[PDB]
């Protein structure tokens with residue numbers, strides 16, 4: 354009934370490989386719904402390079418933990434039946450399901466094939482640095498165990514255009530298959546960033562184009578998805594992702610939300626991509642991700658007035674999926690840029706209580722990351738989810754008018770009981786700030802939902818109130 358949306362990435366990189374994650378999801382549905390979560394982004398649910406694979410070393414997109422391939426029936430998360438049981442539970446609890454989609458490459462080929470290739474400059478793929486010669490690449494996929502269920506398409510080297518490993522001479526190099534082009538258009542870092550890892554798919558082939566379109570539709574119908582989380586799209590030809598997206602929305606009755614991961618600390622690059630997509634999807638606010646990181650790393654000298662400066666939610670709050678961290682940014686991972694405990698609460702309040710952006714809660718922060726002795730922040734986040742779910746409504750007023758202390762308010766809406774809130778925080782010494790919260794809320798007494806401050810704020814006749822916060826902390830006052 355107008356309820357704010359809150360997405361949750363239900364997994365972290367160091368989750369246990371006990372194949373019980375789908376069951377946890379099923380049992381957690383109700384609690385998650387009650388807490389304020391409206392959508393769940395599940396990890397790649399298909400068979401990867403191995404059982405313990407997080408999902409990105411995707412082997413067979415049609416095996417959702419149902420066939421004995423790559424040394425296991427189930428995936429790291431569980432069986433196909435448990436995943437469907439989980440999804441059903443989420444649905445009955447009014448939670449949308451977004452599937453993670455990996456179409457950039459494939460890994461775990463069943464066998465190798467002789468292929469004429471050329472070495473290219475790692476920092477500039479447009480440039481070859483060797484003559485063409487035959488290498489043995491892992492490009493043959495037969496999916497033994499699936500027995501052609503759902504599809505009989507088989508992958509071969511001619512469906513790809515590159516790999517980073519030659520089994521013949523057993524060496525690592527970035528190989529571009531001779532007489533094949535890098536995809537385009539794609540991100541231009543390193544000249545051409547078509548190749549990332551594994552066996553890189555060449556979308557110029559109409560047969561590839563159709564297979565992934567057909568697969569996408571089969572996947573969407575099989576799990577009854579409500580959207581997707583498009584993986585490593587800055588490496589995938591832009592025109593194709595666009596094509597693919599349009600194709601799925603055409604085949605599916607239900608609406609489909611789409612958020613793509615274009616990983617670049619550059620809002621312009623992201624805007625350029627959204628232009629090419631005709632703004633038909635949202636993108637994770639990566640610059641914002643790094644804003645939080647820079648602020649976490651720098652400390653009190655960071656000017657809080659520029660916290661949203663350069664973000665995506667700032668420029669196009671309607672096409673931005675905001676978050677603080679994920680499986681790639683947690684300690685030790687490839688895109689590490691972890692927001693420390695002291696700042697994480699400020700970051701979360703910033704994406705959960707403001708009107709712009711679609712906020713996403715990270716499983717790792719919510720339940721903690723045991724592997725790294727990172728505590729569960731459930732308590733701190735639930736309070737903010739309560740703020741977002743019941744108080745972050747109505748007209749917004751911002752106050753990024755000081756380097757340490759900044760805040761904003763939401764007047765609330767007639768449609769919702771006691772909604773309305775005032776957020777204030779400082780990444781340096783504490784302080785206070787007079788902010789407007791709507792003359793219609795005059796005479797109310799607001800208290801801090803987080804409990805980081807006991808101050809009791811009464812709204813005066815003109816709709817104003819003075820809010821407080823201690824150093825390096827955040828408060829969210831509401832009429833409770």
Ligand SMILES: [K+]
Pocket residue numbers: 457536546547548549553554588589590
């Ligand atoms: K690519």
Ligand SMILES: [K+]
Pocket residue numbers: 642643645646677678679682690691692
């Ligand atoms: K981060």
Ligand SMILES: [K+]
Pocket residue numbers: 652653654655656657756757780781
């Ligand atoms: K500061």
Ligand SMILES: [K+]
Pocket residue numbers: 805826
């Ligand atoms: K605290």
